[PDB]
Design a protein around this ligand. Structure first.
Ligand SMILES: Cc1cc2nc3c(=O)[nH]c(=O)nc-3n(C[C@H](O)[C@H](O)[C@H](O)COP(=O)(O)OP(=O)(O)OC[C@H]3O[C@@H](n4cnc5c(N)ncnc54)[C@H](O)[C@@H]3O)c2cc1C
Ligand SMILES: Cc1cc2nc3c(=O)[nH]c(=O)nc-3n(C[C@H](O)[C@H](O)[C@H](O)COP(=O)(O)OP(=O)(O)OC[C@H]3O[C@@H](n4cnc5c(N)ncnc54)[C@H](O)[C@@H]3O)c2cc1C
Ligand SMILES: Cc1cc2nc3c(=O)[nH]c(=O)nc-3n(C[C@H](O)[C@H](O)[C@H](O)COP(=O)(O)OP(=O)(O)OC[C@H]3O[C@@H](n4cnc5c(N)ncnc54)[C@H](O)[C@@H]3O)c2cc1C
Ligand SMILES: Cc1cc2nc3c(=O)[nH]c(=O)nc-3n(C[C@H](O)[C@H](O)[C@H](O)COP(=O)(O)OP(=O)(O)OC[C@H]3O[C@@H](n4cnc5c(N)ncnc54)[C@H](O)[C@@H]3O)c2cc1C
Ligand SMILES: O=c1[nH]c(=O)n([C@H]2C[C@H](O)[C@@H](COP(=O)(O)O)O2)cc1Br
Ligand SMILES: O=c1[nH]c(=O)n([C@H]2C[C@H](O)[C@@H](COP(=O)(O)O)O2)cc1Br
Ligand SMILES: O=c1[nH]c(=O)n([C@H]2C[C@H](O)[C@@H](COP(=O)(O)O)O2)cc1Br
Ligand SMILES: O=c1[nH]c(=O)n([C@H]2C[C@H](O)[C@@H](COP(=O)(O)O)O2)cc1Br
Lengths: 245, 242, 242, 245
């Protein structure tokens, strides 16, 4: 059973301007918050320059002059499924994010799906070799678990003795095992992730993930991510580049 | 002129549950996001127990059990004014917040306000010594500025000439000079900030700040901040403990 | 082929007291640096108190009064082998360390070792089920790799060709696969790691790593890591608590 | 009275190669640790490439391909004196350092020194204005301190009484007041600080600090800091620029 990548946006920033500040803007939520924060450094609430007189204009300028720390005020959360364990192992190396991830120490592996590496996707023979190997691993897991459950029956706590058995049984589960994860980060963190992972140096799985995150981030905060350009490589995979990263 | 502490909540989490996840809860925003993230770890979406089906009950349990990392998903931002420079010098030592602060390099301080230390708030004579000293500093600052702008006549760029002068002139501005700051943190970082700063060991200025943030945070997310109990000290200042 | 846990201490803080500061202590390296930094807050260079007039006494005082940020100045690095991929996936959730880890994308995984879960180390039957499962996975790996290199045959860069094949082939490699990692952290990060992972709540594999790290750290900085008491549980695994 | 900038290197990395790894290098300390960490990723313990078979060649390569995360393993600590309170307020915005700083709540300041802004150092008239204002501020501080100690007489704990008094009295102390601070960071953090602070956009005081840190860092680890070129500006201050990050 194979699992496709799904990225669901589950949280963003709600903004409410302070009533006493003599400033309004062209925008809502995160992008308005970022402008407000930038202007707070200068206490410059008026709008002399027509170019930076819209929210998008202001943000593009903030970006251009390298005031990136202002972007940290707004955050976005995704719920991600159809991502492999090897992919999450790379993702969580990014330390300016917060994560909550499906636990193999706790969750049943009996119905677990696998994620096909993008370089194999179009090849039914390779996919077959993968899913068969995954079926073999799952049978092994159930084998180990049954025996381990009996070994750790001594222990009164239901939650402990279930962890002890599954945590050892998990040893046979492959890299391609599906996982699920809530990832939260601010705009500055999201931008770094995209610059690092939406590139030809990156594994094609996390690259695909980064591109999908960028597309969804651009939908909620266009002005913040507009400097990123998506291009398609010879193999048809997608990369994103920005002059500011 | 003096400036009182003002704390204004300007941003918080907006949550939309994923349509295809078979789960609901009796909350929205940050508290609902926290519960979703917690349950994602176990895929424990079904809620058969109607006596543990509440968001508040789940959030309390998350913290009884000590899974504090789940709290990081939700954030709140404040715009804080009427805070002194010595106070922000303490505040910014907290490395899990994001900040945007009023710049003395960029902002003229000829009209700047003073923040009165809570310890001298009820002594008019002491406040007078402070405001007189502030006025003298501001005069010195204006004297230095004019003399620096001339010393920097060599600079053809008028914006840069004014920044070079201002950043040097700022040297005489006192600790009690008002500043203004946007502070953003997730629930975990706010909790830690409150624990450290709303305590008898902390300076009264930042303690006042922490108690006020707490009061607003507790209204926004009761279950997350309910464990903190405010206590009034012998001297009338407030502390908070969990 | 199985791999035992090995933790090797490969780096630590070298301290040189600045000459024109009227202060000395009965210690070296990391512990000495921590006292220097704590004393710099107070400029308390002379030692009026005979109790904290020793380095060990000064550090125990720092801890009791809760001044844990001073511990961040000193650091230690380990090279860890005989750790599984599922163990590293847990370890790297600690965001206040720095890591350099063996790459499956970059390193040919021919003759990879497997780490046996401590829970089945005494069970020869369970070990065998594991090791032949691992053997089957490596066989599948070689089969995919060969087909993948054939598939990407067009790709002109041969290095990039092997990498594209290897990153996809790695898909069948089990959690138990051995990995190797350099981990660097300051004393405060190390203490937090030990507290969270040398506990009954934690997986037994990371718990074992945390205990061994603790033993080596306590040998390097006794005063910093002394409060941790190691006790053997019912099943004969160790936990450490302070 | 006035305090000159002083930067003292007080800690760095001690390295010992694990005996059972088949690798040696010609370097010691931080730079050797960085090579070890980089080789661990590839388990490339042998040395086939005369271009990367030395520590300097290896680090040259690490720097060119930009895997700066391996630089995080080595650290350096300085004790910095003759820095102003406005300079530390900028410095501590860098969140990947660790700090221990002289406390005004805790340490008496009746006799504290003043730091002259670089843009003012050459001018006797401006220096006099500054020192005169500092003398006035210290007199006010003393005046406030005594009255506050008297106002807080109903605190039986004299230590607390002096602190309660001092923390309020410090209200009048100017930005130019000298402070002292231990700063610890890894190589990657120091590179970022230098890049951000030893620049034309930065305040002259912190730029002077960054340059001195850079000078000491590049003497200790020349391969790590070689890309930073020191340039004298027209006003006689120095900046540092690099093609890298
Ligand atoms: C193609 C590629 C190949 C890779 N190969 C390997 C490999 O072989 N082995 C391996 O172990 N990893 C490898 N990685 C992981 C990589 O080295 C980083 O650890 C990971 O990508 C996180 O990115 P980041 O380093 O920018 O840190 P993040 O955690 O994403 O932090 C963001 C930024 O914050 C700063 N920062 C965060 N923490 C610190 C700190 N403690 N000190 C100083 N500054 C800090 C840095 O500026 C950093 O850029 C690879 C990554 C890529 C994309
Ligand atoms: C027994 C146990 C069970 C676990 N179960 C799960 C699970 O089911 N699912 C899952 O995804 N993870 C799980 N984890 C991982 C856990 O939630 C943490 O992510 C991990 O242990 C890292 O430790 P830490 O949260 O204390 O933070 P670290 O990353 O080690 O940071 C140390 C300290 O820095 C501070 N800090 C760091 N980053 C932030 C931040 N951005 N905001 C505010 N403060 C910050 C906090 O004070 C923190 O305590 C589990 C861990 C344990 C030990
Ligand atoms: C010339 C100049 C002008 C400035 N003007 C102002 C101003 O007017 N107002 C003001 O408030 N500040 C101002 N600053 C401060 C500036 O915004 C930064 O806060 C400070 O320089 C720290 O640098 P850093 O942002 O790169 O963060 P560092 O703390 O130095 O972090 C290093 C890297 O880690 C990563 N990182 C750290 N924390 C996070 C996070 N929480 N989320 C995502 N990534 C993270 C980023 O990649 C960052 O580059 C100014 C600084 C300079 C040099
Ligand atoms: C009453 C009191 C007195 C103080 N006195 C002094 C003083 O005299 N001199 C002085 O310099 N400072 C002093 N401070 C500042 C204090 O040391 C901290 O720097 C500040 O309170 C920030 O809090 P924090 O250390 O918990 O770190 P935060 O930056 O708030 O981080 C939150 C958590 O993240 C983790 N974390 C963040 N960064 C790291 C890191 N690099 N390594 C490991 N873990 C990390 C820690 O778990 C920490 O608890 C004082 C603070 C208080 C409240
Ligand atoms: O592109 C990469 N991304 C990444 O995050 N790593 C980190 C993740 C993991 O902690 C370790 C080994 O990763 P791979 O097995 O995916 O190569 O290095 C390595 C490479 Br190459
Ligand atoms: O209660 C405190 N809070 C705090 O943040 N510091 C930090 C802030 C600054 O970096 C340095 C000196 O602070 P004070 O001048 O406010 O003591 O230590 C110190 C004390 Br005591
Ligand atoms: O004890 C734990 N330690 C841990 O680090 N995690 C993190 C690591 C990974 O990101 C995710 C899933 O971990 P397990 O598969 O090991 O449960 O949660 C979870 C548990 Br439970
Ligand atoms: O060059 C700068 N460096 C800096 O760190 N800040 C931060 C420091 C402080 O938190 C706030 C105001 O700093 P200045 O008063 O030094 O501008 O912004 C601002 C500027 Br401009």
């Amino acid at each position: 059973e194979t699992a496709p990548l799904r990225v669901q946006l589950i949280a963003k920033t709600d903004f409410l301007a302070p009533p006493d500040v003599p400033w309004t803007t062209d925008a809502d939520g995160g992008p308005a918050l970022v402008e407000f924060a930038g202007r707070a450094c200068y206490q410059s609430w008026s709008k002399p320059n027509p170019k930076t007189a819209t929210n998008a204009g202001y943000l593009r300028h903030i970006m251009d002059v390298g005031h990136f720390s202002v972007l940290e005020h707004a955050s976005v959360s995704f719920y991600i499924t159809g991502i492999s364990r090897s992919c999450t192992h790379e993702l969580i190396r990014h330390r300016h994010f917060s994560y909550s991830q499906l636990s193999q120490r706790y969750v049943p592996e009996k119905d677990s799906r696998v994620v096909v590496p993008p370089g194999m996707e179009d090849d039914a023979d390779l996919r077959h070799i993968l899913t068969e190997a995954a079926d073999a691993a799952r049978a092994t897991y159930s084998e180990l678990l049954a025996k381990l459950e009996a070994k750790f029956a001594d222990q009164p706590n239901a939650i402990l003795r279930r962890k002890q058995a599954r945590q050892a049984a998990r040893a046979v589960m492959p890299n391609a095992t599906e996982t699920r994860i809530v990832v939260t980060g601010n705009y500055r963190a999201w931008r770094h992730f995209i610059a690092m992972r939406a590139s030809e140096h990156a594994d094609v799985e996390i690259r695909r993930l980064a591109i999908e995150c960028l597309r969804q981030l651009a939908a909620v905060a266009p002005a913040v991510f507009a400097d990123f350009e998506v291009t398609t490589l010879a193999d048809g995979t997608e990369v994103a580049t920005s002059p500011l990263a």
